[PDB]
Each structure stands twice: as C-alpha cells, then as structure tokens.
Amino acid sequence: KENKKLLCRKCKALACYTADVRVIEECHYTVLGDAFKECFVSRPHPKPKQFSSFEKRAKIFCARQNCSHDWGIHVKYKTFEIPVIKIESFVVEDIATGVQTLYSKWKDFHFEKIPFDPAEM
Numbered sequence: 146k147e148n149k150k151l152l153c154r155k156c157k158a159l160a161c162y163t164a165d166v167r168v169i170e171e172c173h174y175t176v177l178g179d180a181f182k183e184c185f186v187s188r189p190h191p192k193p194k195q196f197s198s199f200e201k202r203a204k205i206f207c208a209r210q211n212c213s214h215d216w217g218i219h220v221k222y223k224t225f226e227i228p229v230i231k232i233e234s235f236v237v238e239d240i241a242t243g244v245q246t247l248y249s250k251w252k253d254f255h256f257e258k259i260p261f262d263p264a265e266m
C-alpha cells in the first residue's frame with residue numbers, strides 16, 4: 146500500500162517510514178538510513194542473547210527526553226551493525242488520515258516488504 150509512518154508508541158515521536166524498512170531472514174525488520182539513527186540510542190547489553198542469524202549487542206531506545214521507550218535491539222548482521230525493531234514498540238499512522246494502528250506482530254502488518262540487500266548497505 147501507501148508509505149506509512151511509525152511513531153514511538155509511548156512518546157509518539159516520528160521514528161521512520163515504512164519505506165525505510167527492510168526485512169532480514171523473512172522476520173527481522175531493520176531500518177535503512179541516517180535519519181533513523183538520529184531517533185534511537187544504543188545501550189550495551191551485558192548479558193546478550195544469542196540469536197541465530199545475527200549477534201545481539203544492545204537494546205535501542207527512543208532518543209527523546211523522558212521517553213526512552215524500548216524499540217528493539219542493535220545487531221551485527223553479516224558485516225553490518227544495524228538496528229532490529231519491534232512493531233509493538235510503535236504506532237502505525239496513515240499520513241493522509243491520521244488513522245493509527247497498533248500491531249503486535251509484523252505477521253499482521255501488511256506493507257511492501259523489501260528484502261534486506263547489502264547493496265543499499
């Protein structure tokens with residue numbers, strides 16, 4: 146469908162657009178672009194889990210002051226350090242109507258799911 150906005154569930158700030166999204170291994174969504182790196186901060190994790198396709202390194206959070214809502218983890222995939230976000234952490238809003246949706250699982254959120262390509266980086 147049309148491009149869509151993802152807002153910090155807790156603080157509503159603008160995180161990114163569906164267009165910036167890319168999918169790794171079919172069920173891991175990351176966000177291309179520098180703009181997005183301006184929205185979250187990484188906090189190292191002392192007891193990182195051990196996922197299958199990537200290596201966890203930290204939890205990322207809304208940069209916003211007095212928000213710091215949990216958005217997801219930051220990882221090493223192949224040779225890139227990239228974020229991996231949780232849909233539940235956001236609110237999907239349609240630009241032209243402001244209708245906002247709360248998804249709990251990407252399986253249910255339906256947009257153009259472009260497979261992550263190292264080209265774009």
Ligand SMILES: [Zn+2]
Nearest residue numbers: 153156207212
């Ligand atoms: Zn926030």
